[PDB]
Amino acid sequence: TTILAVSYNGGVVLAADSRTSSGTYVVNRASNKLTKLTKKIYCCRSGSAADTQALAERVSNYLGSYQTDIGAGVNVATAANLFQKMCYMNRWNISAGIIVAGYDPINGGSVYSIPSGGSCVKLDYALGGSGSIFLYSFFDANYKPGMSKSECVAFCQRAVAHAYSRDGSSGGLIRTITLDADEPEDQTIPWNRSPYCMEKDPKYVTQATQNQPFSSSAKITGNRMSSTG
Amino acid sequence: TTILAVSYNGGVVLAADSRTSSGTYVVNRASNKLTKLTKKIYCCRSGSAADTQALAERVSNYLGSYQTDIGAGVNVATAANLFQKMCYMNRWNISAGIIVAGYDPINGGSVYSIPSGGSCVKLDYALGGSGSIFLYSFFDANYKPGMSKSECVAFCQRAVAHAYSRDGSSGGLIRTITLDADEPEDQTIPWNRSPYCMEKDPKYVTQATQNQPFSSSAKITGNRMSSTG
Amino acid sequence: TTTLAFRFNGGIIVAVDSRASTGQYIASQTVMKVLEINDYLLGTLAGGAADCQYWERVLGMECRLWELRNGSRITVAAASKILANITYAYRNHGLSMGTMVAGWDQFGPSLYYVDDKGSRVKQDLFSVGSGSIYAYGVLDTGYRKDLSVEDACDLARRSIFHATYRDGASGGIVTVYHVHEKGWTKISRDDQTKLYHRYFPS
Amino acid sequence: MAETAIAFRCKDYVMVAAAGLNAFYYIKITDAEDKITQLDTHQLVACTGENGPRVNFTEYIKCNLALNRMRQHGRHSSCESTANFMRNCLASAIRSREGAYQVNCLFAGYDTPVSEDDDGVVGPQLFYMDYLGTLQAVPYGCHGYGACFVTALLDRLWRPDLSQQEGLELMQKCCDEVKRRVIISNSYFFVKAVTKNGVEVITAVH
Amino acid sequence: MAETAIAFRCKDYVMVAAAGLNAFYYIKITDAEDKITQLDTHQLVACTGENGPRVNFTEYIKCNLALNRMRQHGRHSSCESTANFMRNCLASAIRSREGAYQVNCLFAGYDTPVSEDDDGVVGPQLFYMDYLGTLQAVPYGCHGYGACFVTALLDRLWRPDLSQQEGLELMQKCCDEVKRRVIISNSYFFVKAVTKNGVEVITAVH
Amino acid sequence: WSPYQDNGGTTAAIAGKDFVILAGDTRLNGDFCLHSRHDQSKIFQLTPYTYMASNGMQADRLQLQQMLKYRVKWYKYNNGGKVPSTKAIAQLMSTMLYHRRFFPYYTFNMVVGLDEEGHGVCYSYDAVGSTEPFLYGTRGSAASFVEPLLDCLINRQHMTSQAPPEMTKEETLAMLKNAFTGAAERDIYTGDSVSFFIITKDGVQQESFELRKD
Amino acid sequence: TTIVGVVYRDGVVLGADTRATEGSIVADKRCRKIHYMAPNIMCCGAGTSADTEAVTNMVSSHLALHRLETGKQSRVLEALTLLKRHLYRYQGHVSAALVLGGVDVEGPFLATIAPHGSTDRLPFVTMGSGSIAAMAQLEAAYKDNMTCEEAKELVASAIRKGIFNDPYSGTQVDVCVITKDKTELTIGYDKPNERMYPRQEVLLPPGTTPVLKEEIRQL
Amino acid sequence: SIMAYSGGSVMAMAGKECFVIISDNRLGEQLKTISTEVPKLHVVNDSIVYGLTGLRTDQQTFANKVQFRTEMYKLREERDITGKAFAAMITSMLYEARFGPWFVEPVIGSIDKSTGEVYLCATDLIGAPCEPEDYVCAGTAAESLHGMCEALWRPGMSPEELFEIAAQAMLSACDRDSLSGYGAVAMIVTKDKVTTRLIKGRKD
Amino acid sequence: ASGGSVIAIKYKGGVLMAADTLLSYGSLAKWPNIPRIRLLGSHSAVCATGSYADFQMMAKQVEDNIERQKMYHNVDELSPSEVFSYLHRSIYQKRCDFDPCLCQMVFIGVRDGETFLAGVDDVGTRWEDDCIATGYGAYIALPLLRQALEKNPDGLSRGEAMRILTDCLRVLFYRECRAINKFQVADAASDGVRISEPFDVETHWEYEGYCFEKTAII
Ligand SMILES: O=C(Nc1ccc(F)c(-c2ccn3c(N4CCOCC4)cnc3n2)c1)N1CCCC1
C-alpha cells in the first residue's frame, strides 16, 4: 500500500495505489484507498482494509451527524482528531496507518498523518503504507512546496508510481483526489499510462550479465540467449 | 548502514556512510565500510561488522595469493565470485550484505551485489544496507547512467546523504572511492558539509503545528512558544 | 517449615519450628507458626506465611463473629470447614498454605489438616511443611494414643527437632502447645540447637 | 487415579469399595479416608479425586438431595434421578469459570417402591460417572489406576446372581488385585453395600 | 525415588535394605526385584533407579572389580577404592554423550586386613552416592521418597554400637516407616548385611 | 514492557528501649543508570511515632505511601483525633499489601516506630504482608549484607563474651552508619547518602550521612 | 567496567575503572583491568573477565614468542589481528571486549575489538558498561594532538563518568601511557572515592567464638 | 541452581603474615541435608589451602584433578607449588572447560613462606580470578559473607584476631543461609604453623 | 512515532530543557520538524522520550486539567509541582491499568523563585534533580550535566547552563542514532517558559584519526 497527501495553496491532493494483497497474491487490483469522510475531507487508508474501512465508516458517520447538528462545514482538524481518538483507543486491536486530508474554509488545505501509534501530526505532506518508505528520499530530493494544483497532482502521481515500482505490496491504478474550495476532482491513472515504471525506464533495459556463455576469456560479453551461440 | 557502488565509463564509485550502531547507540561514528580487496577492487560491507571484516580479510588474502601466483591483475569477477562462495557457504551463520566493485583492464568498471542469500548479481549500480531501501526510488528518479567520474562521485555522495538523512542506522561521514585505470581517489565528506540533510533543507524549517495555544477559534495559527502568549 | 499435630488420650499436641526461608536465604528464625485463633482453637501456618497468616486471621474473625451471633464457641469441624471453604474458593488463585486446625469443642478434641486446594482431612496425626517428611519418621515410630502429656510433648518436640536438623527450610525455635478440655497451653519454647545438646549430650 | 474405586451390582445388592489413600505428593497423609459418601438411606457414591473437589462435590449433592426431600415432604428420589442430578452438576461445571470437578464417581443405590403406586425400577442400580459428566448404567465399574485390573477380573468372575457372601469374596479379590499390581499403595479399602435394608459398612473386606 | 534404599553402619556390620518394587508407569511388574548387588565377598551396593541403568551400572562396576582382582592376582580392593571407582564412573557419565546413570547408590562394605602389613581401615564402611557422583561416607543414609522419613528415624534411634539383632529391629522400623508413609508401594525390602564373615541375606526383616 | 522496575537502595532499622533509628540510602537507580542521589521517597512519616521504610520499586512505594497516609487520615477522623499505634499501622500494612496479592506492590516495606510501652519496634514485610515485630530489620538490595551483621552485633549468639550493656541511641546510630558504609562499598545499588531518622517519645531527630558517591 | 583509550601526539593513554563485580556485589574494589600485551602494547578488558583474561594472556604469549622469531617489536596490528581472529572463531561466546592501545614504528594505534571480533581503529574509544558515559566525556573534550597531561586528564575524566554514573564501574582510575619508548602504568591515577567514615573496629577478643576441636601443626 | 544444589560456603581472609580459610560443614541436595561433617577445604601444601563450593560432584572431581596436577607438579618440579602458580593453574583448568564448565567456585588462600605476603584468589566457574587484599568468599552464603567480612575485616590483623572475625562472619552468614552451616572448619595458616579449628555453630 | 532524548538542567533563576525536533518511526526519521517541547499552562513545559501518541494524549489530558481548573473556579493556576504531581499520578494510574503512557517525560516549571525540574517514567517512577535526562540523554548527557553541576556547586549561569546543554546535544547528535542536529530549548525563568526557535550545533568530523587511510580495515 502507498498513500500520500501533499498540500498546495488552495487545498490538498491525496494519492494512492490500488492494490490490496493477501501477502503475495493481489486480492483486489482496483481498491479505492481514498475514502470520503465529508464532501472535502478524505482519508487514505493503509493497513488492515477491514480496520480502516470500519474506522473510515464510523468517522464519516460521526462527521455527518456533527455537520448536521452544528449546521456548518466540518474542519479537517475535527476529522483528524476523531480519527486519532479511534486509531488510539484501538491501537492494539487494529493495524491502521491513516492520512486525513482535506479543505475547510478556516484553515484551507490540511494534511494529518495518523500512523499506527495513534499520533496525529499536522504536516505539509504525509506518506503512508508499505510504499511510504520508498518516497521519503524521493520527497527530500524532488518535492518543492508551493506547487500549483496541477503540479501537485502530477507530482503525487509520479510519487505513487515510484513507490509501486519498487514495493511489491503496492501497484495497480494511481487514484488522486484534489480537495479545495472547488468541486473535488478525482482521477485514476491506469498502470499502462503510469508516469514511471521500471519496465519502461531505459536505465533497466540492458539485462544483468548473469548467464554468460562458456568462453576461453574472462571478458564478460553478454548473456547466452541461443544454444547455438 | 548505507553502501552503494555505481559504474561510470572508465570505472566505479563506491560510497558509504560511516556509522556502526549497536541498535540505537552509535558505537563507531567513522567506520570505513569501503574495504580494499586488491589495489583496484573494493567491497562495501553491510550487516555484521565482525562477519564482513572477516570475509573481506579472508577474500583480500586469497586475491593477494592469487595475484602473486598468476603474476597478473585480478578481475573484479574473480573477487565477486570468491566473495559469493564465502557469503553462500556461511549464509546461515553470517549477516553480510556485500557489494564488490572495482576496475580490471579486461572488463573495466564492474559492480556485483552479493546480498544476504549469497546471490551474485552484476549491475550498473548496487545499493546495500538498511539505508538502501531509501535510495531505490532516488535512483529510479534521479540516476542517469553514462555519468562522468566527477558527476558519479557528486551523485553517490548526494545518494548516501539522502539515505542517512532518513535511516537512523546510517549517518556520519560519506566515504567514496573511485576505482578506474588511474590511482584510486578516496575522499571523506564530513556531515557538516554533506550535500543534503533534512536539518538544512528549507522544506523542513517551518515546524508542524502540533502544540497550538488555547484559542476561541478553530483557526490553526502556530505553535505556542511562550507562556505569556 | 515443619509443623506437626497429633491427637492422643491427653488431647492434642501441636509443635512447630520458627524459620521462614525463601529456599536459600533465611528471612526469619522467629516466625510464630501457631496462630491462637480463640482460647480453644489453634491454627498452624505452613507454605506462604502471608497466605496462612491472612486467612487464619480471617478464620479467627469468622470464629469470633460465630461466638457473638450464636453465643457459643464455634466447633473445630465448622472452623476447619470455614477455612477449607476459603482455600477451595481460591483453589486456582495460587494460594500456598498447609494448615492444621486443632481444638477442643463440645465433641472432644478434633484435628483437621486444610490445604490450599480446599482439602480438609480429619485424622489423629499430621505433619505439614518441607520438614514433614522428617518429622513423620520420628513421630510415626514414637506415636501411641496412650502417651502421657509429658511424653507426647517430648515426641512432638523431638519430631520437630529432627526436621529442623535435616530440612534446610526448617529451624529455629521448637514451640509445643497442648490442646485439652480447658483450652490450650503453650507447653515449651526451646531453641533447636539447645535441643541438639539435650538429646545428644556428647 | 491414585485412589481406586470399585463397584458391582448383583440381584439384591450393590457393593462399593474405595481406596482409603489420601496423599500429598508422595506422602500418605492417611491410608483410611472414607471416599464412599451416603447421599440417602439407599444411595451412596464412591467418589475419587483430591479431597477438596471430592468433598465439595459430594456434600453439594448430599445437601441438594436433602433439600429436595425437605421440599418434597420426605419423598426419597430414585437413583436414576440423583445420578442424572449428579451428572448434570459435573457437566455444568466443565463449562464454568471454576473448571470441572476433578472427581470420578460410582453412584450405587437400591430403588425400593416409594408407595403402592410406584411402577418404577425395584432393586440395585449402579452408575459409572466420569469427571466430565459421562453417566452410564453398568453392572460393575471402576475408577483409578486399579480400574482396568479389576474391570477385567470382574468381566471374568462377576455373575448377576452372586450371594452377599460370594460378593465379599469377589470384592476381596478385586481389592487384593489393586494392591498386587498398582504401585500407588491402596492398602485399605472402605467397602459398603446397598441392599433393600439400606447402606451397610462391610468391615470383613478391606 | 519410587524405590527406597536404606543403609546404616554399626561397630561390626553394615545393614542395607532396598525396595523390591520394579514398576512400569503405575503397574507393579514385581514387588521382589533384588536391588542390592554383591560387588565382592565383603562389598555390596543398594542401587536405586530404573532397571536399565541400575543393572548396566552395577554389572560394569562388578565386572571391572572382578577384572581388577584377576590382574591384581586375587587382591580384594578396599571400600574407599571401589566407592571412588564407582563415583568417578558416575561423575564421568554426567559429562558424557550417553548422559548420567540415573542411579542412586548406598555402597556398603567390610574392610578386613588384606595381609599382615595392612595398616588400613578395619571394619564396616558405608558410602552415600548421588547419580551425579556425589560420594560421602555416612553412618547411615537413604535414597528414594522414603529416604527423609528413614533418615530422621535413624537420627533418632541409630547408635554406633547396636547388636546385629537391634539392627534387624531398627531396619524393620525403617522399612515399616517407608510402607506407612510413602504412597509408592514398597511392600517388600531385600535386606542384606556385610560383617567380617561377608554378605549375609537377612530374610527376617522385609 | 514490565509494570515493575527495581529502583534499588537499602533500608535498615534498629530499635532500642526508648527509640528506633530508621535509615535508608538516597540513591534512586533506573535501568543501568542512576536517576537521583537525593531521593528521600524511601522513608515516609505516617505518624509522629511511626514511619514506613520501603524498598524495591519507587512508583509503588509512592502509591503505597499515599494509600497508607489516607487510611491513617481516615482512622484519625473515625477514632476522634486519635492517631493509630505503630502496631495498628503494622497490621494495616500487612492487610493492604495482601489485598494487592494478585498484582502486588513491588515494595519491601518496614514499619518502624514506638509501641504502647515506648519501646522501639520494626515490622519488616515481604511483598504480600507477612511480618513480625523485631528489634531490627533490613530490606532492599543490601539487606542480605546488613541483616547478618545486625544479627552478629545485636544478638551475639555465637559469642562467649558477656553481652555489652544495652546500646544507646548514639551507639545504635554509629552501628547503622557503619553497616551502611559497608553496604555502600559492596552493593552497587546502595550509595550516595543515608537519611537517618531517630524516632523517640520527644520527637523525630533526622540527620543525613555521606556514603561512597560511586 | 568502563575502559577508555585516547591517541595523543606522542602515544596512547589507556584508562580503566577497578571494580570487579559478582552480580550486584563488588568482589574486588581495586582489580587491574589494564593488561600487558607487549612492551609497547597494553589491552584494557571489559565483558566476561575469564575470557578477557584468557584471550589477552593467550595473545600476549603468542606476540612474545613471535618477537623472538622476528627479533622485532610487536606491531599493534599483529596484536589486533590475533584477537580479532580468535574472537571471531568463537562467534562471541568468548565475550572479551578489548581496547588495544600501543605504539609501534607506524605510530600510535588504538582500537576496540568487539566480542564477535569486529575492530574499529579510532583516535578515542570506550568499552564496557560505562562506555557510553565515558564516550560522552571523550566526544565533548577530545581534540587532536593533546599533550600527555591533557590526554591522561581527559581519560581520567572519561573513566570518572563511568565510575559515578555506571553501577558496574567504580573505585579509582588506572591510567596507562604507552609512548614510542616506554609504557607507564599509573594505578590510582585518580582516587575520587577514598574513605567516608573511618572503619569502626568491632573488637572480638580471642576465645569469643566457641571451638569444639583444635589441631595445631608446627613447621 | 546447579551451584546452590549441594550447598556449602567457603571464605578466606588475609591478615599480617597469615590467612584464615573457613568452610561450613553441610552437604545437601537442595533442602535435604545428607551430612553435617563435610568441610570443603583441601590442603595443597604447608602454604596453600583451597575450598571448593558448587556442585559436590564437581567439588570432588575438580579436587581430584587438582590433586593429580599438584602431585605431578611436586614430582616434575621437585618443589611445592606456590599460591600464585596454583591459582593460575586452577584458572587454566576451569577455562579449559569454558563451554561445559565445572560447577565449582574455588577459594584459594596462600602464604609465601619467606616474604610472609598473603595471596587470596576466589575464581568463578570459568576461571576468572578475583585477587583482593582483604578476603574472598563463595557458595550459598556468599552475599551474606561479603557483608560480614566487609564490616569486621581490618588490614593488619594477627592470626587469633583474624580467626575470630572469620568465624563470626562464616557463622553469622551461614545462620541466614538454608544451604550452609552445621558449624565450620577454619584453618589458620601462618609461616610458622597451621592451626585447624572445628567451630560450634547451629544444627539448623 | 517516537521522541528521542530530552535533557534539562537548572541554572541560577530557571531551568533549560532541550530536545531534537524529530519523531522517528523505528529506524526511519519520519518528521524532523516536530515541536516536542510543550508548554503546560503559564509556568511549566514538558517533553517526552517514547510514544509521541501517548505523550500527545497525556499532554492533552494535563493541559486541559490545568486550564479547566483555572477557568471554572476563580483559583490560582496549578504550580509546576502540582501539574507534575497530576502528570505522575496520571501515568502511574495508566501502568496500573496495564495501558501505560509508554514515555519518559521531563518536566520544568517556575512559579516565583521556585524552580521545578523532574522526570517521570512509563511506570510512574518520579525524581526531582538539578539535571534530568530521558532516552540516551540519561546515558550520554547526564554524566556531563552532572559534572557541570559538581564543578559549579553554587549554581550555573544561564550561559554556562546553555554551553553545557549545547555540548550534550552535540554528543547526543554524534552517538544517539535516532537524532537530528536540530534542537529547541525551553527556558523556564520567572516571566514563564520560552521555547527557542530551532537551532543546530557545530559538529567536528575532521579528526586525523577518522581519515580513510587510518579507519581502513585493509
Ligand atoms: O506439607 C504438606 N502440606 C503443605 C500444603 C501446602 C503448602 F504450601 C506446603 C508447603 C509449601 C512450601 N513450603 C516450604 N517451602 C518449600 C520450598 O522452599 C522454601 C520453603 C516449606 N514448607 C512448605 N510447605 C505444605 N503436607 C505434608 C503431608 C501433609 C500435608
Numbering used by the authors:
A (entry chain H), B (entry chain V): 55 to 283
C (entry chain L): 100 to 301
D (entry chain K), E (entry chain Y): 1 to 206
F (entry chain M): 126 to 339
G (entry chain W): 30 to 248
H (entry chain X): 2 to 205
I (entry chain N): 2 to 219
What did the study's authors say about this model?
High-resolution cryo-EM structures of apo and 8-bound L. tarentolae 20S proteasome have revealed a previously undiscovered binding site for inhibitors of the chymotrypsin-like activity. The binding site and binding mode of 8 could be clearly determined by the excellent quality of the map. Unexpectedly, the inhibitor does not bind in the proposed binding site of GNF6702 (20). The ligand binds mainly within the β5 subunits proximal to the catalytic T100 residue. Hydrogen bonds to the side chain of Y212 (β5) and to the backbone amides of G228 (β5) and S229 (β5) within the β5 subdomain all anchor the molecule into a largely open site that shows great surface complementarity between the ligand and protein. The fluorine atom establishes an orthogonal multipolar interaction with the backbone carbonyl carbon of S195 and a weak hydrogen bond with the side chain of the same residue. The pyrrolidine carboxamide sits in the only enclosed part of the site in a narrow hydrophobic pocket that is limited in depth by I29 (β4) and capped by the pi-stacked residues of F24 (β4) and Y25 (β4). These three amino acids are completely conserved among L. donovani, T. cruzi, and T. brucei but become M28 (β4), S23 (β4), and N24 (β4) within the human protein. The alpha carbon of G197 forms part of the floor of the ligand binding pocket just below the fluorophenyl ring. The presence of the larger hydrophilic side chain in the serine and cysteine mutants would result in a steric clash with this fused aromatic system and would be detrimental to inhibitor activity.
